[PDB]
Design a protein around this ligand. Structure first.
Ligand SMILES: NCCc1ccc(O)c(O)c1
Ligand SMILES: [Cu+2]
Ligand SMILES: [Cu+2]
Ligand SMILES: [Zn+2]
Ligand SMILES: [Zn+2]
Lengths: 153, 153
C-alpha cells in the first residue's frame, strides 16, 4: 500500500490530522482522521493545486483540477480531482473524517501528494448552489486550516 | 520549468522559506531562500524520507536515501539523495541559502516533493567525523524546524 498524511493548521483554532491509504495503484484511497476547533455544521474539504503555504492557506491556489472540470461533490462525475465534499462538525467542534474516494490517487497524474488539503469556513454546496461561484469553489468561503500532503511510512 | 516550496517552522522562531526550481527533469535543482532565528554557525540541512509531521519533525524519519547509500556532503558521490550539507548563519541569526544540486530532483525516483526539509541544531560533518553516526546523520543533532516540500506555481 501507499500512504500519505497531512497535518492541518491555520491562524485560528482549527487543527487536524488526516491520513490517506491506497491499497492498489489506481485503486480507491481511504481518507481518515479528525479535525477540531470547527463551528458546528459543514466545512468544505478539498485538495488545492499547490503545496505552497508561504503566505498561509491562500498560497495553495484553486482546487486541484488536472482535468479542467467544473466543481462538484465527490460523488459527481463533473468534479475537480480535489473535490472531497464536506466534513461535518458536531457541537463540540469535532469532525470525524472517514471518506473513500476513487478519483484522487497517491501516484500518477491524479496524485495529491505535495499538494495542500484545506478545510473551509463554510459549507461546500457541491456545485448545486445556482450561482457562478458554486461551480468553481462551491461557495465554501475562507480557509481555516491547511497542510501539505506528505509521503508517509 | 518545475517549482517547489517549503515553509520551515520550529521554535525560536526558527522559520524559513525555501524555494526549489528545476528547468528540466534531467537537470539540477536550484535551492534558495532564507532561514532566521538560528544560532551563529552551521546547521545541517537535509531532505528526510517522509513528509509526515504528525508528531513534529521527528515523524519525517531518516535522511531521504532511495539508493541505500551512506551519509555525505552534497559534493560527494557517496551521499544520501537528501544530503544538502549545511546552511550557515551569522550573528544576526540568518542563513542565506543558495544551493544548486544535481542529485535531488522535482520528478522521478529522486523526487523530493512530498518529503520533509529539516534544519538541524548543529553542524553536519558531511560524513567525515570518524564515528558511526557521521555516516548516518552527520552528527547534526536535533531538528529545529521543518516543513513538507510542496508543488509550487
Ligand atoms: N477497508 C479498508 C479501508 C481501506 C483501506 C485502503 C484503501 O485503499 C481503501 O480504499 C479502503
Ligand atoms: Cu478548498
Ligand atoms: Cu536532516
Ligand atoms: Zn472543486
Ligand atoms: Zn544523509
Amino acid at each position: 500500500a501507499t500512504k500519505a498524511v497531512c497535518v492541518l493548521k491555520g491562524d485560528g483554532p482549527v487543527q487536524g490530522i488526516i491520513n490517506f491509504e491506497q491499497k492498489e495503484s489506481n485503486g480507491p484511497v481511504k481518507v481518515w482522521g479528525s479535525i477540531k476547533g470547527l463551528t458546528e455544521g459543514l466545512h468544505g474539504f478539498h485538495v488545492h493545486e499547490f503545496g505552497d503555504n508561504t503566505a498561509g492557506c491562500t498560497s495553495a491556489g484553486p482546487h486541484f483540477n488536472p482535468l479542467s472540470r467544473k466543481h462538484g461533490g465527490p460523488k459527481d462525475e463533473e468534479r475537480h480531482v480535489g473535490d472531497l465534499g464536506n466534513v461535518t462538525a458536531d457541537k463540540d467542534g469535532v469532525a470525524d473524517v472517514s471518506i473513500e474516494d476513487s478519483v484522487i490517487s497517491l501516484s500518477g497524474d491524479h496524485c495529491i501528494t505535495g499538494r495542500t488539503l484545506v478545510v473551509h469556513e463554510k459549507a461546500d454546496d457541491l456545485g448545486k448552489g445556482g450561482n457562478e461561484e458554486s461551480t468553481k469553489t462551491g461557495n465554501a468561503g475562507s480557509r481555516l486550516a491547511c497542510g501539505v500532503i506528505g509521503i508517509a511510512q
